[PDB]
Amino acid sequence: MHSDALSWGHGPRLFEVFLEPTCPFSVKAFFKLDDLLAQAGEDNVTVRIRLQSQPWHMFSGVIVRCILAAATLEGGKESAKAVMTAVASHREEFEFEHHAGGPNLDATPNDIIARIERYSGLALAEAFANPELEHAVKWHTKYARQNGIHVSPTFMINGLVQPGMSSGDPVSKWVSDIG
Amino acid sequence: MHSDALSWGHGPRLFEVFLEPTCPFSVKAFFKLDDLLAQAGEDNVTVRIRLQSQPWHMFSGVIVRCILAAATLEGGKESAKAVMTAVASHREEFEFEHHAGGPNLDATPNDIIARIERYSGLALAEAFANPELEHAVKWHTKYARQNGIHVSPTFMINGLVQPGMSSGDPVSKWVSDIG
Amino acid sequence: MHSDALSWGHGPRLFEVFLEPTCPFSVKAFFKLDDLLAQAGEDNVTVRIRLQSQPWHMFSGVIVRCILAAATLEGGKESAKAVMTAVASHREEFEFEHHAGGPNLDATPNDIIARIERYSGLALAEAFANPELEHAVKWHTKYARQNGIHVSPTFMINGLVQPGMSSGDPVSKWVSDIG
Amino acid sequence: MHSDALSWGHGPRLFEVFLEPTCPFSVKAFFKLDDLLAQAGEDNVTVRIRLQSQPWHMFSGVIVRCILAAATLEGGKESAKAVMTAVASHREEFEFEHHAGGPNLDATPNDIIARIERYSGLALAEAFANPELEHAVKWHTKYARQNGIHVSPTFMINGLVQPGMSSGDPVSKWVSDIG
């Protein structure tokens, strides 16, 4: 039951968002999630973040693993949010120019972890080292793949992909979309 | 055409295999593709490799990009095959203990590229930097996702996934399975 | 909400089963869902039926529409369940010898509807004619397709397909599989 | 190898179209296929029809089975085309008003077969009766489902779904799309 650690709200309409942590459209949608929840109310929607790792974002596997490591800390899903926020705020610094070059060609995973730790104020290296943690990475990927998710972000409402929803929408459109 | 770079044989039965370059089971299946073609016959089958980048294999994105970078050199698919072979032979050195730890925590994308260059004897860095190369990476991923590939390896015969086929199989079983 | 008409129990582990109403294996699994809920516990699981219409079951579209028509009557899911039970009990009479022949070659959609009405003791024709009902049929099909369901039945636990689970399984195996 | 019976051309770009025989958009695309082939040339494209049976088209299973029965006759893929053309020309007559009512509520499969036979000039009942024929129906469905096909028509080029292509396009757009 990894299907559960990145949920907010408890209401019967289910909004699922597939996010790539270093993707600029993903980040835009990410930063609108608070408002969505605040508008719709926790008694009416459950909002779930699903991690969509993109192979052409070469540190995604590391970054994704951090987010999920953070989720095992005491802050749980909030520590995970902290990490996503730290990365989202400093997006370019966790990606590669044209998905090919730039300073990160010379950054190590341990660098990327340290850098997340700085920005988030969280201690990740020990949690990251936990071997059970691969199963959370696998769950997200397997779930994304079963649902045919490619583009980040992708929005599902009650289990159906909603091609018309965009990270550019006003929160108020998401609110009527969710219905 | 991204859809047929990594392609061998010219027969009418299409055999597609999804491989993660640093996955032990993938490597096992990879080293059987020569026999497969020999035993099935180039007049009967076409064998194509698709790259299944697994996010829990943290250097997969770098490595997959290298493979597709090699396919752009003069030797095409043979140079890509050279790169897959070099990674496959030294699989452990391009992965992480329990997909979490070990020396690769302290390696950089550039370390990994240099390493594949050594072992394959190919010059890749320049080709790796070509910004058009993200599209090849996207094509494999997109095709994999549309077909719902998750487990590596997975085998397709004429566009249908074959959940019974396995990397442990004797090649002679693949030959009858293909038909 | 199409996504939860055919739903029982209120537990947090979600058990989804894709059923073709005239499929022998589906029928077998269908008649085990009462035990499943009893043994797993309504406090632990939610069981949902999704309708997997198989095109080689030639009256499936008529029959699936009837089921979803029943769900619109006052008895809701219980009336839909009544219709599934009536079809299930007389499965052979709503199918075709070798999916090709037999008496149903000479039956009409109206014959099939009357037949289900007899056996379930429900009045369906009027509800069947409601033009809004195509959307329920579309919803199941769309959801099935997005998840890549093909074989009937197929089982999902918390949104992941479970290829190991089977209609032959003892219900006690389902209970441990669910967890 | 059912993957093969509805192909025209032999060129290296592969245009796959998923069609529902009684779907009006499907029919529109269907009638443009000749021109597409004539423009692009049989040495440059292979054009493949994939049958997308829609459960809310209540005689689709029957009609689809006919098409595939026709493919086993001596005319092979042309006899199959004849059937698709006979149905396409008389579309409404093989469907239901609002996918719910109309005269067809009182039509039997044997009626639908006879009606196809009239319009196509072909003898189908014996071919239809063949039990092997279920495997062709299964192949199309399984292939559609693995690829996540819902909407009819859906267009793939070299194995990727092309969301931007429409049955409303000019043939000349398809030609540059296929590239």
Contact D32, D171 (CB under 8 A): yes
A77: tokens are 């899903």
How many angstroms separate the CA atoms of A84 and A66, rounded? Answer: 9
CB-CB under 8 Å, A56 with B55:
no
Distance from CA of B104 to the nearest CA of A (A): 8
Phi, psi (deg, nearest 5) at residue C19: -125, 135
> In sequence order, which residues have a C-beta less than 8 Å from that of residue B83 and are 6 or more positions away?
B66, B67, B70, B116, B120, B122, B124
Cβ-based contacts of A141 with chain B (< 8 Å) = 54-56, 150
Cα-Cα-Cα-Cα dihedral sign, residues A155, A158, A164, A165: negative
Query: Which residues of B fall within a CB distance of 8 Å from D163?
Result: none
Residues of C in contact with D61 (CB under 8 A): 55-61
For residue C97, give both structure tokens: 């010898």
Residue of D nearest to B149 (CA): D146
Contact between C137 and D57 using a beta-carbon 8 Å cutoff: no
Instruction: Quote the minimal CA–CA distance from A142 to chain B in Å.
Output: 6
Structure tokens at B28: 């096992």
State how far Cα A80 lies from the chain centre: 9
- Determine the number of helices (DSSP H) and then strands (DSSP E) in chain B: 8, 5
Would you report the helix, strand and coil content of chain A in percent, each value rounded to 5? 50, 15, 40
Residue closest to B91 by CA, chosen among B17, B168, B24: B24
Report d(CA A99, CA A25) in Å as an integer.
Answer: 15
Q: Is D113 helix (H, G, I), strand (E, B) or coil?
A: helix
Distance, in Å, from the CA atom of C111 to the CA atom of C129, rounded to the nearest integer, reads 15
Q: Measure the CA–CA gap between C93 and A84, rounded to whole angstroms.
A: 57
Cβ atoms B48, B146 nearer than 8 A: no
> What are the backbone dihedrals phi and psi of residue C63, each rounded to the nearest 5 degrees, phi first?
-60, -45
Nearest to D57 by CA among C147, C113, C65, C143: C65
Give the chain D residue nearest C107 (alpha carbons): D108
Q: Do D149 and C148 touch (CB under 8 A)?
A: no
Give me the half-sphere count of Cα atoms (radius 13 Å) on the Cβ side of residue A110. Answer: 9
- Pick from B51, B57, B58, B151 the residue to mutate for testing the A interface (most A CBs within 10 Å): B58
d(CA A10, CA B168): 45
CB contact under 8 A, D159 and B3: yes
Angle in degrees, CA B116, A107, A167, rounded to 5: 105
Q: Which residues of A touch B134 (CB under 8 A)?
A: 56, 98-100
Best mutation target among C22, C105, C138 (most D Cβ atoms within 10 Å) is C105
Phi, psi angles (nearest 5°) of residue C13: -85, 120
Chain C residues within 8 Å of chain A (Cβ atoms):
1-4, 12-13, 139, 142-143, 146-148, 158-161, 179
Cβ neighbors of A56 (< 8 A, separation 6 or more) are A99, B61, B65, B134, B137, B138, B141
Question: How many CB pairs below 8 A link B and D?
Answer: 37
Q: Is B152 helix (H, G, I), strand (E, B) or coil?
A: coil
- The contact set of A with C (CB < 8 A) is 1, 3-4, 12-13, 139, 142-143, 146-148, 158-161
Cα-based torsion angle of the residue sequence A20, A25, A26, A29 in order, rounded to the nearest 10 degrees: -170
CA distance B112 to B63: 8
Q: Residue for token digits 């459109």?
A: A173
Q: Are B116 and B63 in contact (CB under 8 A)?
A: yes
- 3-state SS track over chain C: CHHHCCEEECCCEEEEEEECCCCHHHHHHHCCHHHHHHHHCCCCEEEEEEECCCCCCCCHHHHHHHHHHHCCCCCHHHHHHHHHHHHHHCHHHHCCECCCECHHHHCCHHHHHHHHHHHHCCCCHHHHHCHHHHHHHHHHHHHHHHHCCCCCCEEEECCEECCCCCCCCCHHHHHHHHC
Q: A64 near A140, Cβ under 8 Å? A: yes
Terminal Cα distance for chain B, rounded: 27
Query: With the C-alpha atoms ordered D52, D155, A20, C2, is the resulting torsion angle positive or negative?
Result: negative
Q: H or E segment at D134?
A: helix D134-146
Beta-carbon contacts of B54 under 8 Å, excluding residues fewer than 6 positions away, are A141, B20, B23, B60, B152
With CA atoms as reference, report the closest residue to B10 among B32, B37, B34, B33.
B37
Neighbours of chain A (3+ CB pairs under 8 A): B, C
Amino acid at C118: R
Q: Report the interhelical angle of B171-178 vs B33-40 (nearest 10°).
A: 50
List beta partners, residue C156.
C16, C161
Other C-beta atoms within 10 Å of B46: how many?
A: 18
Could you tell me if C167 and C32 are in contact, meaning their C-beta atoms sit under 8 angstroms apart?
yes
Cross-chain Cβ contact B150/A149 below 8 Å: no
Q: How far apart are the first and last CA of chain D?
A: 27
Q: How far apart are CA A17 and CA B1, in angstroms?
A: 32
CB within 8 Å: B143 and D161: no
Contacts of D132 by beta carbon, 8 Å cutoff, 6+ apart: none
- Kindly state the tokens that stand for D18: 């998923």
Structure tokens at A65: 């693993």
> Is there a contact between A158 and C3 if contact means CB atoms under 8 Å apart?
yes
Expressed in angstroms, the distance from the first to the final Cα of chain A is: 27
Residues in chain D: 179
C-alpha angle A77-A83-A88 in degrees, rounded to nearest 5: 120
Distance CA D70, CA D65 (A): 9
Which one of A55, A56, A131 has the shortest CB-CB distance to B100? A131
Please tell me which of the candidates A107, A108, A128 has its beta carbon nearest to residue B100. A128
Nearest to A160 among C142, C148, C161 (CB): C142
Report d(CA D1, CA D146) in Å as an integer: 16
Contacts of B2 (CB under 8 A, 6+ apart): B135, B136, B139, B140, D158
Asked if omega into D12 is within 30° of 0 (cis), the reply is no
Distance from CA of B52 to the nearest CA of A (A): 9
Q: Which residues pair with C1 in a beta bridge?
A: none
Residues of B in contact with D154 (CB under 8 A): none
Longest dimension (CA), chain D: 47
Half-sphere exposure of B31 (CA within 13 A, CB side): 13
Asked if D148's CB is within 8 angstroms of B159's CB, the reply is no
Alpha-carbon distance D80 to nearest alpha carbon in chain B (angstroms)? 21
**Torsional class of B41: left (φ above 0), alpha (ψ -120 to 50), beta (otherwise):** left
CB nearest to A61's CB, from B58, B131, B137: B58
Q: Where are the alpha helices (DSSP H) in A1-133?
A: 24-30, 33-40, 60-70, 77-89, 109-120, 125-128
Torsion of CA D15, D20, D21, D22, to 10 degrees: -140
Multiple choice CATH, A1-179, 3.40.50.300, 1.20.1250.20, 3.40.50.1820, 3.40.30.10: 3.40.30.10
What would the two tokens of residue D139 be? 């192949």
Residues of C in contact with A7 (CB under 8 A): none
**Chain C residues within 8 A of A158 when measuring between CB atoms:** 1-4
Question: How far away is chain A from the Cα of B133, in angstroms, using its nearest Cα?
Answer: 8
Reported as type and span, the H/E element at residue B9 is strand B7-9
* CA B142 to chain CA mean position, Å: 15
CA dist., res. D56 & res. D37, Å (int): 31
Contact D50, D16 (CB under 8 A): yes
**Three-class SS of residue D51?**
strand
Instruction: Look up residue D28 and give its amino acid.
Output: K
Q: Report the sign of the C-alpha dihedral through residues D165, D169, D170, D173, in that order.
A: negative
Alpha-carbon distance of C30 to D133, in angstroms, equals 28
Return the exposure string of B27-36: e unless at least 16 CB atoms fall within 10 Å of the residue's CB, then b: bbbbebbeeb
Q: Do D100 and C145 touch (CB under 8 A)?
A: no
- Give the angle C52-C55-C59 at the CA atoms, nearest 5°: 90
Tokens of A117: 């730790």
D136 touches D142 (CB < 8 A):
no
C to D CB pairs, distance under 8 Å? 107
Beta carbons of C58 and C98 less than 8 angstroms apart: no
Cβ-based neighbours of B129, under 8 Å, separated by 6 or more: A100, A101
| Rounded-to-integer distance, Cα C47 and Cα D11, Å | 49
Residues with Cβ < 8 Å from A50, sequence gap 6 or more? Answer: A6, A16, A17, A18, A19, A140, A143, A144, A149
Find how far residue C20's CA is from the centre of its chain.
6
This entry's atomic model was obtained through: X-ray
Nearest chain A CA: its distance from C3 CA (Å): 7
Q: C139: Cβ–Cβ under 8 A, 6 or more apart, which residues?
A: A160, C2, C3
Q: Which chain B residues are Cβ-neighbours of D143 within 8 angstroms?
A: 159-160
CA distance A79 to A85: 10
Number of residues that this document lists for chain B: 179
Q: What is the C-alpha to C-alpha distance for residues B107 and B94, in angstroms, rounded to an integer?
A: 10
3-state secondary structure D54-98: CCCCCCHHHHHHHHHHHCCCCCCHHHHHHHHHHHHHCCHHHCCEC
